[PDB]
Amino acid sequence: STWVKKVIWYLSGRNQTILQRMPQTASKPSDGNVQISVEDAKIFGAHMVPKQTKLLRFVVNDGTRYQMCVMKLESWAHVFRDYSVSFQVRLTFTEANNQTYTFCTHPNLIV
Amino acid sequence: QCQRETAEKNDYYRVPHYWDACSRALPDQTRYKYVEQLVDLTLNYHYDASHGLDNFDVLKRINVTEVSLLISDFRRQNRRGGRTTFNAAGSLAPHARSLEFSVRLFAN
Amino acid sequence: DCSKNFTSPNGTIESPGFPEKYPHNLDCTFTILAKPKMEIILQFLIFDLEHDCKYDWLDIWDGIPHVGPLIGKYCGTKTPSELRSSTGILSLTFHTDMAVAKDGFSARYYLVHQCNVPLGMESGRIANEQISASSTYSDGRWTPQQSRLHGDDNGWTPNLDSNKEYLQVDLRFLTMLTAIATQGAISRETQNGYYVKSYKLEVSTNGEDWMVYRHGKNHKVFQANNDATEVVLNKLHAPLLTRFVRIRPQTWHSGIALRLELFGCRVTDAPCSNMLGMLSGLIADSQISASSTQEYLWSPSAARLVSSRSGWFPRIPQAQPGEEWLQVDLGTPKTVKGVIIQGARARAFVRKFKVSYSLNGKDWEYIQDPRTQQPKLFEGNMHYDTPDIRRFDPIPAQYVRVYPERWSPAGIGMRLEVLGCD
Amino acid sequence: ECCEFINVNHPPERCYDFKMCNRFTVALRCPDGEVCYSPEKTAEIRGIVTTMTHSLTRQVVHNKLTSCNYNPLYLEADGRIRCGKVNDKAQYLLGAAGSVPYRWINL
Ligand SMILES: *[C@@H]1O[C@H](CO)[C@@H](O)[C@H](O)[C@H]1NC(C)=O
Ligand SMILES: *[C@@H]1O[C@H](CO)[C@@H](O)[C@H](O)[C@H]1NC(C)=O
Ligand SMILES: [Ca+2]
């Protein structure tokens, strides 16, 4: 079966060591001299499309009123010729039709 | 720190973005604990999209509160890791606010 | 709803229900939109709103509301003085609270239609609401409102003769000044008196920040009346563009006395230049674009000349000379005649720049100077607030870009408006 | 005038706007229409309005003291609003939030 083989392909990369190590090294205070092995970088290069973008909507209730807002997620991956890997994200919030100041753009959170 | 006694001067005037400009910075452990969740979930979503999954169960779980707090914190001071491993920057504007960050891992 | 739109040669306006009390929780807005080259004159005839006010108010905008400059917020029982505009759009906004109302307002609107015509200090064209000062003396016999040049009455004096005390007048619309005329004042009741010997001019577009007139590197001190008997007038070597004007004395022979006159012009009274609407808001927010921005979340409203709190900056303040540009699409083919350029508030300004245009996309013509040697370069501002106007041969276009080439060491930063015609 | 009457014996439920008119009196937009109210305990206006503060949409709070550019605002016990400061006790603020209540919706 072709689709079976495509599922096998998809699940083969899932558990990759980079996809575990990244969120740790993104959270530690320093940990800059992280080593990653060349073969792991190679198999990372095999699995990521250089672009993705998504919109998702959500609703917030300000007491009696309701307000609808669009989150945009856009993300990129790359592999340098020196086998370095790079991943980046940009995440934005906006009113579902543009507005000057709204609960989604300015929650004024108490902290 | 904020220019507190220049912004706070009067009861009946505040420069816009005042509250987000001088609300207190997050405890640093909390900051890392939120960043770890966000990097994890967005990397999962990217791999799954790279293979054409819809992946809605993952996208459901990004907490808008926590990202908004990080946007504020990286606006007060955009932060950088330990050839520097990491970068994060906030941005804030009337119609929108945003977060941008990157993680890099090195062959050497 | 109540948000009636008007364009007709003569008419009337009022809050819903007149002379009856206006409803609660209104948020009405009204627009007067003039034909080209036609003045708007607006005169109020009743004003009584219950109360800088906090509950109910009338705003007036020199443009679309929340886009054009605010003319004023008006409230209580002082009838807003008659106002005249050439910018072509004048909008009113009426806010009411949930709970209290009074007789409201009614007004009437009309239309009609060198550079040394008096603005109208003597002729009441500056109403008593437009004049103010730092303080009065205790006696109330030298108040600001009497500063009419040929008023056979005492001049102004503040509580102390000193160099910080000031007189201020608000010319509600952008207006161009050519000369300042002065008289001293003997007291009519007691034949001793006061007169100014020298004084300084402070000018602003916005009133929150200022520029003090200079001629050469030194600040100017003007020379003034020898005694209170006769008029003196002093003429500016090139016209200033201003909204607020403030006179500060510097040396008084025996007390401070000011009677004053303001000579000038409208910018609309060059041959055919009208502002196409960066200031008034008629260039919508989608029509302004730039090569780069100081952050990803740019807001194009920063470009406007007097309605923007802070100006544009490129992504890097020290960009490559002539690499960055700012563009407007005028939305229709138009004659362009000139532009007005201003600094941005870092506090920085553009010093030399060039202009380029096309009737269509993917094309760029250069507005070369008449001589064959090189493309025309225009001298810009010398200060972050005071605008400067530059004029060139008739150029039909629809896309216009401005390219900086020299800037204040704090980087490129700018605000802009374009003078067009048909 | 803002009141000539009192229309109430206890604070009406689920109301949605307020304005104080005398110093001694406060009146409310409520589902049934407006009510004018007074507590004899002259401090209680603050408690009453605080107990109603959940309803007030961000624009209604911005119409008051509107120079405060949508930033949170505070109640003195005598009823006058001022701009709140970032240090102020979180109870006595309107327009602040403890969290953004949110629900993803499918596309
Ligand atoms: C979002 O985060 C806040 C604090 O960070 C927490 O109290 C809340 O339960 C979280 N909600 C979700 C859905 O994760
Ligand atoms: C409009 O009003 C002006 C006011 O001076 C008057 O001169 C003019 O005749 C009026 N025109 C009409 C058509 O009423
Ligand atoms: Ca009212």
Author numbering:
A (entry chain D): 104 to 214
B (entry chain E): 19 to 100, 104 to 129
C (entry chain N): 148 to 198, 207 to 268, 276 to 507, 517 to 593
D (entry chain C): 29 to 135
Paper text:
The HCMV Pentamer, composed of gH, gL, UL128, UL130, and UL131A, enhances entry into epithelial, endothelial, and myeloid cells by interacting with the cell surface receptor neuropilin 2 (NRP2). The other critical tropism-determining complex is the HCMV Pentamer, which is composed of glycoproteins UL128, UL130, and UL131A and the same gH and gL proteins that comprise the bulk of the HCMV Trimer. This elongated heteropentamer mediates tropism for endothelial and epithelial cells by binding to neuropilin 2 (NRP2) and triggering the viral fusion protein, gB, to facilitate entry into host cells. HCMV-directed antibodies isolated from asymptomatic donors predominantly target the Pentamer, suggesting that Pentamer-specific antibodies may restrict viral dissemination, making Pentamer a target for the development of vaccines and immunotherapeutics.
